Structure formats: structure tokens, C-alpha cells
Amino acid sequence: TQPKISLSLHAADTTIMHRVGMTGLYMTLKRLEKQYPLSRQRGGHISWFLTADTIELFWEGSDFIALSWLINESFQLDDTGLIHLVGLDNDRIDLRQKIHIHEGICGVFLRLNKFYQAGEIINTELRFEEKQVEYQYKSLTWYAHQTFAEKLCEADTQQLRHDYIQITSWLYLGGIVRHARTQNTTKLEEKPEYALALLFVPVVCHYCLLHIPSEDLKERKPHRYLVVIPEIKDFEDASQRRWRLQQLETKQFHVSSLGEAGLLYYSLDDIQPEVAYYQACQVWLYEKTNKASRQRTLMSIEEIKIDKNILITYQQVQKYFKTNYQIIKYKQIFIKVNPIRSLIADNLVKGIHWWSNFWEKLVIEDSKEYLFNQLFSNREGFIIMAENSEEDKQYLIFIKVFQQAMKGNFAKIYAKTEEGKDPPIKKKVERLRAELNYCYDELSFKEYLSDFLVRGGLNKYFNEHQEEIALLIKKSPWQEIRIWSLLAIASYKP
Amino acid sequence: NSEEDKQYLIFIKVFQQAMKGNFAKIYAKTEEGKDPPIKKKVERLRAELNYCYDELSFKEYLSDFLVRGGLNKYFNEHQEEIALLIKKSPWQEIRIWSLLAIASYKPKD
Amino acid sequence: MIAPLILYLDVPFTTFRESHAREMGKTYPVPPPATVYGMLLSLVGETNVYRHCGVELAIAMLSSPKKSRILRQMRRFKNADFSHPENVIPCYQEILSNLKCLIWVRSDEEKIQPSLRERIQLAFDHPELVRRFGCLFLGESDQLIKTIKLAREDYLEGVRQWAIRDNRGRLTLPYWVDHVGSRNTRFLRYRIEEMDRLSPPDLAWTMVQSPI
Amino acid sequence: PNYYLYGTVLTRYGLASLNHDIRRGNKTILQKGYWNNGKIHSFVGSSAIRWALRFYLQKQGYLVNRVWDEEEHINRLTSEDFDPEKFYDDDIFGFALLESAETEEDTSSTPNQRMGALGMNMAVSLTPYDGAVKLGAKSGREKDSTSLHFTEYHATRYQYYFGIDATHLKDFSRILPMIDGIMNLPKVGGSSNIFNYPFCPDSLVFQWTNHFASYISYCFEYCDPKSKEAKLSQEFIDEVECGQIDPSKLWIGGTIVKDLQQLDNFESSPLNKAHIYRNRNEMIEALKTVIKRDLGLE
Amino acid sequence: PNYYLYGTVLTRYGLASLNHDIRRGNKTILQKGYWNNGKIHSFVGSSAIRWALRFYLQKQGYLVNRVWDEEEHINRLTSEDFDPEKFYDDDIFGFALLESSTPNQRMGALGMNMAVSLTPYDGAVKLGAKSGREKDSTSLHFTEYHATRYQYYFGIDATHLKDFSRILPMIDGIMNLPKVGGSSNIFNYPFCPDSLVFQWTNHFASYISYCFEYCDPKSKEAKLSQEFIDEVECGQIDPSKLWIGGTIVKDLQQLDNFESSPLNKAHIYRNRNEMIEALKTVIKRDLGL
DNA sequence: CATGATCTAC
DNA sequence: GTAGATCATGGA
């Protein structure tokens, strides 16, 4: 007959959040249809017709009953009190990732106690590497997503409203009432179908934790939340992408940059050489303004557009660079992120060189060689990135020249120092890094680099590339040369 | 390549030829033994270049070394350009170029 | 038919906040048709917004502006007391730097004479006869317009980034804005296609109409 | 007949940490963004300069509705009902009321709002920003937290563009104090304790015209970072030569006058017939005489 | 009225290491950055000069809230609640109590800018080494020094002072500045003024910030900048509000056509004490002290 | 801090 | 009876 609710990706009045909501509704409807094959089983005889880019809902009787059934089945709470979204395959996902998703939803969408009633703080001790760590999360008893069906329908006639519905920030992220004294009027208003879409928004979007490297991970656990909102091209494509992202381990969702989360959302995507790959997404940063802040606040929104080359480079970086370490202390799983990858992911997202900000983010902002030590662990990733560079092999030639010079400089003292008196590579590399950090302008840095090259003895790579390396040293900015010297130190093979 | 780059490369070649001449002189003077040292000569040149503290001393040493080199065909072909480059440029940059030429030197096989 | 009017715009800084971006000042990459319509009404000194309904506007981006974020201690009406600390909130506002664009004005569908195109042409012909108030700006009142002038189809004779009405487009720009809430705001989906085209394609024209 | 006063003003060279952004650890980030050629320049918000002008007006009589309490560091309102006919602040900078946000029209009858007759773009550094920070360790053997902070500074000149619709003013005579405040700007909000940066102009390109548009917004630029010569932009001179921007409506003063005069062909250039004074006070006096003659303030 | 005392003060020539930043490994790096025409200059923080002024006020016997223990190297507050009416330091430098009746912060009358080396930093370093053949990891080290003159710009809002008479001790401290935080053991750099350009005007604009220049990139010359002289000639700066004192007076007096320039009718004193006395007399007359 | 339930005044 | 102001209400 006539669909009572019709939603399409081609509608001109929709935004990105609306399309993400229709995608979430599509996934939830697919899962419900798998759960309830027959329309008679579903309350109100609600039935749907799902296409690639259209959603149509048919039901009989009162609209309130059917909408309440659909919404109650869509948003559920398990025995432990965690948010149970039937749109996601909850059997396949483990307890830790379910807790992660529940905490992200509670910290991003349900920021306010006016939209959720909290239960007791449930503590569970799951064993990991012969250690039982106690996860403590705030269980829930109700949230507004469950009972928005009352707001969707009229109070008296119990039918779908024919006017606009005033929504709040829990439905549309960033839909804040700027002036609290005008709460009745200055409120964002949406059609009931788009209100249902905004209800189903949280299913598709994914949540990542942002680690600030200035503060030590042990000294404070992360609290900034990143929301990855994808740009929907097709219901089936985004549904498959989300259900594939369900594979990722919980430790991968901790990042140190927005671009890393944006790429991680698309990391599992399969690249087809014949098909022109193009995807886009938005990363929303939620962060407490002060220490005593009661709720998180939207601070920045970053739009990420990724092509085939960016995805391939990020996949190589993930494959070759060190994964996230899982430091496990008393009843706390401190997930140590990899600053290198993050940086590289951010540089790839911004469209700049993958080494653009290595120095002031790796040496200047390093407390006790915490970031410096990871360079020798990510040496293999550095070698792979240099070898598979899309351009600029002259600076790889410079890497070879500098590595030969470092070999000569180190071998001089290592021949001077006998067995036992020989210092490890760590002390000499630290001294070299300090001397590189000493340089403040072009003249001093170039003087030091040239003297180092001379003290390195005969340099075959420099000899074979006299003109090229000489021009590169003379012309290039000294900061870039310092960064490349740093990453040649990192990829130095004794 | 710009004209500044061309003059810089010609100066590098001039310094390399001067080092060739000086090392040949050392080889002729020190034919005795298994083989005259080569790394020690480079270390001596680096130490003497780093000894210079001001423009006058460094340029005096540079001119002395260049003349001790010998014919220096690249200086034959470029009197005015290389002479003006040496006279004008700050001595620190000339020292940087000289040390780059030292590093990028290939001893004759 | 009379050739559509062409205006060359140059604004050092712009903020076309998103309709739903109230917690953070997110900006549109391209000026929305509603903002351009309001700017033109200010240029001709027309306070009534329903006066020039039916005018069609086409926007061609001469260059891609860069997006930057600036902190701001924006005020709000939260407490009755003006001096209460709750009235001041720190929030980011996204701005666009060095915006250059060409605006096509076509006024065939207007039912009230003189049309907006004729009013703009007359204002540029005799600037001393224009009766308006305030300084011309695009976006926020402090974001003044650097250069607005009558230009031809080839002012930079380069390549143009047009805003094409595509139902699968990324941007959702409004051609009518409800400043109280969002009930009367009307949206259309656009895309930025790189086309040296001097003239606007058929899908690049947006007609400003009332939400009714 | 509308009368607008547009102007681009360049500040003196000095170390500046004026506006700042949200802090990150020990770092107080200067707020910055992209500008010409894609380089990152340090910004000063327009609200900062408007606040500076407000405080200048408050500091020298000039009854204002929005009084800044220096003791409590809070803003106080003398009258809840804004009256542009009485207060300089409401007349120049405008106001917005509670009912202005819950209605579409501008009246609700007393006026619901007022667009300020003065609008100024944000100030940008004439030179691209390079990362420069300062140490902030506080004296004392007791080295607890809240010590060893980093402050970002910028040693360049700042330029900003402003425009006032003099006709829009309720009292036409109020434009003169605003000009005096622009030249005698006390201080744009910033770390004046550590980085005292005077915002008084040292180069002006003013334009007193009846045209709604002025193509003189940002005419100062030299780029070539870590320098302070600050020559006039080539495109501004080209637009002056083209025929638009009538030279008789231009008012140029400050240290840029010396550079303009030192240019060859300047005696025959169309820029020569502009009101050019090395002394800023003389140019301001002549411009205010012209303004008073045009607006009937005599 | 609203009176402001703007001033650019130049220091003597000497070897200076007062601005060490976070050290890189072995060598102690002094704070530096870009300045005029793209060369790197060494900067002395304005907080150093503010601390020196606070120490001067404490030593001279004025009532100061924050007392600095020389033997203990710690800072103690006589009153936990800042009282600008009673304490000189709170009145002058302000305060900001940031922790979870009386105001919690003050803007402070004194506003100072960073001290900039007149001469670009060449790159001089000095080696230090502990005597003795028993040598360990902390045996030898490097310290960067700079042979230059430092100039800095300050501004005082006299009306902002709770007590107007407190401006005179600040001037005395500026002319009698104690040690500015540095390495006094090995680089004893006196920060007392040797060339002043002061401005005591009721107008808010100041055109005297960093008005000193060098004749040669590596020299102790310290001539007045051409821009400042030109702004005096054109009439922008009122000569009756200008106070020039120090060694720059001789160079100004040897200038050609000095007797006909508007710079002549400015308050020019070779002796800095006489200039300070005259300026303080003018300030006392203007403020009604 | 944002937002709704509630208190309360017209 | 309804709109404006107020107050509660949120952790590991």
C-alpha cells in the first residue's frame, strides 16, 4: 500500500547525520528481519522494503504501537546493563568492545542525566594473560532512545505527528540550544521520519579514544572521545563496512590523532584496482573543558577525504609499524598507542609529507626518551615507508649518505673504546640527537651536518651523487634536513 | 640550475681538484712504507678547516690550499665567477661548501 | 533575455555557519544561497526579505579557501543577569580565508518590479543614490567585504569551481534560513564540480523562494 | 547620502602574544590560521579590537551602557534596555536583546536589536608565523606544578581592516571619538604583563567615500618572513592605477609615506593626488575637517 | 587625566647568559629567536625584569606581599589574600589567584615587553669543565653567551595604580635594577640603564618601542633608529613629552643640524640622574603628589 | 554545562 | 492554565 514512513538517500533536505541515521535504521531492520522472519511476529504487523538507497515502512493499526515495538526492539539493555543495539551483531562482539561502545555512547550521545537513568557500577574481572583486570562501567536502566516513540507520536490520537519535532543535542550532535532563556522556541526541529533517523544514528558511527602524548598514559587515563561519522554512499556498502569493522580489537580504537581514527574506520576496506576508490568521513572531538566538567563538549570537527593511495599507505603503515601495546597494571588496562603511526596517519590525511612534523613532535615533546625509544622499534616501518615512497628518492639518497656518516662516526669511537669500554648504540645516538637539537638556524645546522659528514670518512653514496646531494643540502630548508636525519638515525642498521 | 648553483658546483669541483693535487703531493713525498695514509689526510684537512676562526684566516688558508692544489682546470675555466664567489660569500658558507667537497671526494683508483 | 548580472566577490574572512552547528561553529565551504541573498538585499538596502523572492543565484568558486579555527568568547542569553559568568562561553568558530568567487544574478522569476538584478545594476551605476545602513559584509557583521564589483564572464579567465545541485552531493546549503529555530529553513544538496565554465550550467542556478 | 569610513591600519613591529587559543599542556597557543599563499599567520579576533575600542570610550568619559568593572574583571550593564540615542557604546557597537533571538523581525514597539555602525575584520600578522615559545619557570626551590609553562609569541606587525557607516550613527558626532580611539588604541587584549604590544597605528590607508565598497581592505604586505619593511601591496597600487578607488578619497599616513615618496614615477602616479601626510596627526585633523564638513557636524 | 609612562631602555655592552631555556643534552642553550631582518637574536624574558623590580622593592624596604628568601630560595606570601591597597607588588604587578569579597585578580599597572639583544647572536659558546683528573658524566659542559646590549620596552598606566605615589619607586628601580635572573657567577651582566627614551604623555599612543639600532652587525655602537628620528622630525612625537638620557645623548648632540631639529627642544640630559629628577618633578606636578 | 521537571507568577 | 525562572542532575 502506501508507506507510512519513507526515507531515501536522494532526498535534498538531508544532511550527513540524517543519512547515517537511515543507514543505522537499515542495519537494524536487516537484523530484526533476520530475528523476526514473519511480519505477524512483529508488533503491529510492521513490515519494511529495503533497497540500496531507500527505506519504506508499512504497519497496521495504531502508529504508536508499531513505532514503540520497533524502537524498543532496536534499543535494548542486557542483564549487565550495557547498551544493546540489535543493529550490531552482538553475539560476535566480545564483552570488552561492547563496554567500549556503551561508554562511547554514554559519553557522546547520552552526556546528560536527563536522558538516562543510571544503575549500579557493575565490576567484572575478565582474565587476560593470567591477570584478572576489573572493568568498572556505569550500568543503565533506561535511555531516551528507548522511549522516544512517545515523542514521535501524538499523546491523544497516538498517531505520527504531522508537524516538526523539536530535538535536542542527544539526537543531533551539536544541536545545542545556545540561549537557555529561549528553550521553547530556539530549538532545532525535524520531521518525524528524520527524527527516527537521528534516533538510529549511533549504530553506524564508531567511537575512538584520543590519547594526548604530552601527558603520560599511566599518570592519567584518556577521556577525549572521537566520533567517526562516515559519509554514506550506499546502505549496503556502509552496513558491510560497519559489520566488518566489528572485527577490530578494542586496543586499535585508541589513537593519538583524529586522522588515525578516520583512517581506522576505513582500514579494513578492500581496495579494488579497477574501481576508483573514494570515501569521506567526519571525526568529532568531544572533550571536557575543565577537570571538573560534568559532560563532554564538542570542540572540533575534522573532515577527512581518503583516496586509494592514502588507504594503501595507511594499510602498509598498519601492517609494518608496531601495533598498540597493552600495558596491564592493577585492575587497569593502559593501552599504549604508537605515536609514529598516528603522526603518519595525520600527515597522510592532511595531504602533506608523512615526515612533515616528526621533529617537534618526537624529540622536542619527548620527556624521558619515551617517544625516542619507539623509533628503533618502528625502524622496519620506517624502512618500508622510505622504500615505498611515492616520490622524492633524492632524500633517500641523503638518508644513505647520513647513515654512512653515522657508521663512520660511531665506528671511530667504537674502535677507540675496547671491549667492555664500548658504549651501546643508545648513548651515542642520544648524543647525536642532542647535538642535532642544538642547531637553531640554517648556518649552524648545515655547518654541523657538513662536519659530521666529513668526520664520517669516505662516503661512497655522497661520491656517487655529488651534484644531487650537494644541491639538496644547499637548497632544502634545514628543518626538513634535520627531520630526515632523525628518521635516518631511526632506520640505522648497525 | 641557477647561476648560483652552477658557481657552487664549480667551487666544489675546484676544491676537489685542489685536494687531489695536495694528496698527490703527499703521496709523492711519502712513497715510503706500505701505503701513504688517506684517511689521516682527510682528518688533517678537516681539522685545519675547523681551526679557522674568522674570515681573513679562513680565506688565507683556502687560497693557500687552492694554489697548493695545482692547475685546477675548473678554476682555469672560471676566473671571475669563482674569484667573486670566494671574495663575496661569507666565510662560513665557503667552509660548508669546502667540507661538502671533502665529504664527496673520490680518491683516484 | 537580458544577460544575468555577474558580481566578483573578495572577502578576506567568512563564516557560513551550519544550520545544525550550534555547539561548534562549523562553516560551509561555499556561501549558501540564503547568505548571498541576504548580502544582496543589504547591498540594495532592502529590509524586507520576501520582496525579492524568485531571484536565481549561481556561485562559482575562483579558488578553494582554507579552513581555520579561532577561539571566541561568544555570549549567549542563558541567565537573566548580564554580568553572570554563565552568559560567556568559549567555543571554536571555523573561518574561511581569502574567498574569491563570482556570483550570477538572474531575476526572470520575480513578480515585483524593479527586480533585484535591476536594483543591483542601478546601485552600482549610481552609488550615491543607494539608501542603506551599516557596512556590507558576508557572513558575520565583522567580516567586511573587500572587493565587490561588476565583472564579466572571464574576470580571471581561469578555471571555475561551480556549485551544482546534485541530489548525491556532500554539501547541504540552505536557500532560506529560519533564524529562530529550523522549521522554516529549506535545504538543497550541492556539489563542487571543477569546471572552467564561464557561464553557469542549468543545475548551478538556485531560486530563492519562501518556505511556504 | 551614505558616508562610510573604511581604513586599513598597520601596527608597530614588536613581540606579540595577544589573543591566544585553548591551552595544550604548558603551551598557551597563539590562535592562528591560513592566509595569503597558504601560510599560517597569527590572528587577533575582531571582538578583541571591538573590546579595546569599547574600553577606550569608557576610559575617557563618553557615557557607555556596557561598563567594564576593572576590580571584578566583569562586564556590567547600566541600563538593561539599550538606548543608542544616549550611550556611545550602543550607538557604535550595536546590541542584541533576548527577544532578538526568538523572532524574525527586528522589532517586538521598542527596537529589538541594532546592527553596530562599526565593523572591523580580525587583525592578522603581516609575516607568517614561525613556532616561537618562551620558558615560564617561576622562581623558588619549591618546584610544584603550575610551573614551567610555555608562551607562544610572535615578533611581527599586525594589520586589521575596519569600516563604519557614519550615516548609520544615531549621533553623527560620535565618529570623531571612534577615530581618536583607533589611533589612540590603549591595548588589544593580551599578555601585556609579559608581551606589552602597543596597537597604535604606524601606517594608514583611510577612505572617506559614499561608495558601499572599498577595495583597500588589506593593502600592507611584504611577506618574506622575519622582516618588518611592510611595503604596500602590488594589487592595491594596480587597482589605484586602474581607475577604481578614487585617489581623492584616499588618506595615506604613517611610515609608509616615506616609502611611497621614495618610489620613482610617484610624482606622476595616480597615487600622488591622494591626501598623503607623514604625520598621522595632521592627516587625521584634515580627514576630520572633511568629515565634519560632509556630515554637517560644524 | 590618564597618564602613561612609556620607555625604551638600553643596557650596557657585556657578556650575557641570562636567558637559558630547556638545555639540549650537554650544552646550555640561551633563549633566542628571530628579530629584525631575519637574524637570530637572544631574548631576555620580561618576567626576569619584573622579578628584578620586585626584588628591588623588597630590598628598599617597601611593603611587598611576596617576600623572597635569599637564603632559602623560596617565595613566601605575607598575606594569602592579595591587597593591592597595602602591598606595592600587588598594586604594581597585579596578581591572579587560580584555585578551586576581595577580587581574585588584578591587571597590574606595569606592562613590560621582552628584552631583545641589539646585536644578532653570532653563536659564541664557552666550555666549562670541573678541575681534577677524576672525571665523570658531569665533568665538562658548554654554556652559550652573547656579547651585546639588551633593550626592552615597558609601559606604566599611572592612573591604574591604587596609590599614585608608587610610580616613583618603580622608576628608581628601573634605573637601579638589581641582578636580572641569569648566571651571575660566571657572566655578571649589569642591567642598569645606559640609554633611555621615555615618554610621559596623556595620549595612549607610543612610538618609542625598540627605538635603538646598531651601526654594525657586530659592534658596540647603539645609535638611535632612523624611524624614531624621522617621527620626531615630522612632529608625530611631541618633543615636550620626550625624555632622552644616557650615552645616546652625545651621539644625538653630534648630529648635523641638531640645533634646528625638533629633537633639540626635547628633554635631553647626559646625566641620567638629572633626567630622572626632572621627569619625577614633572610626574609629581601632573599627578598632584 | 545543558536540559527538563518543577516552582511560581500572571 | 501556561510561560518564564529556578533548580536538580549528573563519577571512577
Side-chain angles (χ1 to χ4, degrees), chain E residues 31-33 35-36 39-43 116-121:
Chain E
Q31 166 104 39
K32 37 192 158 46
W35 193 235
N36 274 276
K39 324 212 82 51
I40 289 206
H41 289 236
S42 71
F43 304 124
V116 168
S117 66
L118 197 84
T119 278
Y121 175 57

Side-chain angles (χ1 to χ4, degrees), chain A residues 269-295:
Chain A
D269 260 8
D270 257 317
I271 279 290
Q272 286 295 357
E274 66 286 349
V275 192
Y277 187 88
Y278 170 68
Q279 298 278 336
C281 70
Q282 297 183 353
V283 181
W284 295 38
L285 168 62
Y286 275 78
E287 157 186 7
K288 303 192 175 188
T289 55
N290 59 83
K291 331 213 301 213
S293 293
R294 280 68 37 177
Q295 61 196 29

Side-chain angles (χ1 to χ4, degrees), chain A residues 412 442-443 446-447 450-451 453-455 457-459 462-463 466-467 469-471 473-475, chain B residues 1 5 8-9 12 16 39 42-43 46 50 92-93 95-97 99-100 102-107:
Chain A
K412 287 179 62 179
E442 161 160 352
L443 184 57
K446 294 197 179 179
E447 206 143 20
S450 177
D451 182 276
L453 293 179
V454 179
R455 178 167 51 255
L458 175 33
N459 199 307
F462 207 163
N463 172 32
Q466 289 198 18
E467 172 161 342
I469 299 307
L471 261 296
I473 294 188
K474 168 164 185 34
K475 272 191 155 176
Chain B
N1 271 8
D5 296 347
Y8 160 72
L9 287 168
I12 291 206
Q16 285 187 172
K39 162 187 179 180
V42 172
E43 195 67 18
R46 186 201 74 91
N50 274 337
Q92 312 240 30
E93 321 193 19
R95 180 161 80 190
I96 295 191
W97 307 340
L99 291 160
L100 252 46
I102 284 170
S104 70
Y105 174 63
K106 174 51 135 18

Side-chain angles (χ1 to χ4, degrees), chain D residues 115-140:
Chain D
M115 203 208 119
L118 156 76
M120 23 186 54
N121 243 3
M122 66 192 27
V124 315
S125 57
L126 187 125
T127 278
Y129 170 70
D130 52 340
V133 311
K134 253 283 291 162
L135 217 48
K138 65 205 320 169
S139 47

Side-chain angles (χ1 to χ4, degrees), chain A residues 26-182:
Chain A
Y26 174 88
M27 295 171 39
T28 299
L29 288 185
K30 287 292 188 192
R31 291 287 163 169
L32 279 182
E33 138 179 37
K34 252 169 60 212
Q35 207 165 123
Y36 301 91
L38 301 161
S39 67
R40 334 167 293 90
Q41 291 157 321
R42 311 145 180 181
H45 288 72
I46 181 143
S47 57
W48 42 85
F49 179 54
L50 307 179
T51 85
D53 41 42
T54 321
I55 298 174
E56 306 178 12
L57 297 168
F58 321 92
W59 66 73
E60 276 128 44
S62 185
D63 294 353
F64 178 70
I65 311 176
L67 275 189
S68 297
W69 182 92
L70 166 66
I71 289 179
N72 279 342
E73 290 291 337
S74 310
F75 309 95
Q76 283 170 357
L77 284 166
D78 40 21
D79 312 37
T80 33
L82 292 165
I83 298 177
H84 178 84
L85 309 168
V86 307
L88 305 182
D89 197 358
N90 299 277
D91 314 352
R92 162 182 193 178
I93 185 191
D94 61 87
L95 193 61
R96 185 156 87 124
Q97 190 159 359
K98 202 184 196 162
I99 289 167
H100 176 79
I101 292 172
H102 158 96
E103 294 233 271
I105 296 182
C106 287
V108 168
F109 292 87
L110 314 165
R111 296 173 312 168
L112 261 156
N113 69 102
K114 294 288 182 303
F115 308 112
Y116 75 92
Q117 285 162 1
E120 274 63 29
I121 303 179
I122 268 58
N123 308 348
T124 171
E125 299 217 5
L126 287 189
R127 191 210 48 76
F128 174 83
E129 283 183 354
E130 210 35 80
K131 285 301 318 299
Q132 285 206 354
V133 274
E134 194 184 32
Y135 329 134
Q136 310 212 10
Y137 58 87
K138 173 184 46 64
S139 71
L140 301 192
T141 52
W142 162 91
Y143 49 101
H145 294 82
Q146 273 154 332
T147 52
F148 192 73
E150 314 164 353
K151 310 247 172 323
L152 270 180
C153 296
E154 299 168 15
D156 43 336
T157 75
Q158 282 200 358
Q159 300 251 300
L160 199 66
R161 309 240 300 255
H162 290 127
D163 63 311
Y164 289 75
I165 282 151
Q166 292 180 335
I167 74 180
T168 326
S169 48
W170 70 274
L171 264 167
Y172 206 115
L173 298 189
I176 221 67
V177 185
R178 321 240 318 256
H179 317 293
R181 301 173 67 192
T182 67

